[PDB]
């Protein structure tokens, strides 16, 4: 994690870059499988803007195993509380399973942000909740 240094630099805009970098590192520090990615898209009336996001294959445990499921979510600035954009990014050799959590595009359903908002939960807890769901049921179980 040498980019981490350049990361805080790739942002240095967020309300709490430090607090953010600390929240991100914490995540990868808990998983070590995830990786913070950088993205540059337009927003301000169509004006390029730096936006962060987490990506990587989380170690999804099973009844007696632990696979790796890809996930990607956009990290907002600091509102309203957490990033509502949290969807799975499966490959092409996989098989997305439609349900109450997933539709087909691999977009996590439910309000979540408009559910817990204890908040109590944290960036980690967020990816933790999904891991709990992605651990119980197959979010995109692949084939042999």
């Amino acid at each position: 994690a040498v980019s981490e240094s350049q990361l805080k630099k790739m942002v240095s805009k967020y309300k709490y870059r430090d607090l953010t970098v600390r929240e991100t590192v914490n995540v990868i520090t808990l998983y070590k499988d995830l990786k913070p990615v950088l993205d540059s898209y337009v927003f301000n009336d169509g004006s390029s803007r730096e936006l962060m996001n987490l990506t990587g294959t989380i170690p999804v445990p099973y009844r007696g195993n632990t696979y790796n499921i890809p996930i990607c979510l956009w990290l907002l600035d600091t509102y309203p509380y957490n990033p509502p954009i949290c969807f799975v990014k499966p490959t092409s050799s996989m098989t997305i399973k439609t349900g109450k959590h997933v539709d087909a595009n691999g977009k996590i359903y439910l309000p979540y942000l408009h559910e817990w908002k204890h908040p109590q939960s944290d960036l980690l807890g967020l990816i933790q909740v999904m891991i709990v769901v992605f651990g119980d049921e197959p979010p995109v179980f692949s084939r042999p």
Binding site: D33, Y67, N68, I69, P70, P90, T91, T95, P138, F141
Partner: peptide, 9 residues
């Protein structure tokens, strides 16, 4: 590590 995802049954 590659994703793939855990299979069913």
């Amino acid at each position: 590590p590659e994703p793939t995802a855990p299979p069913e049954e």
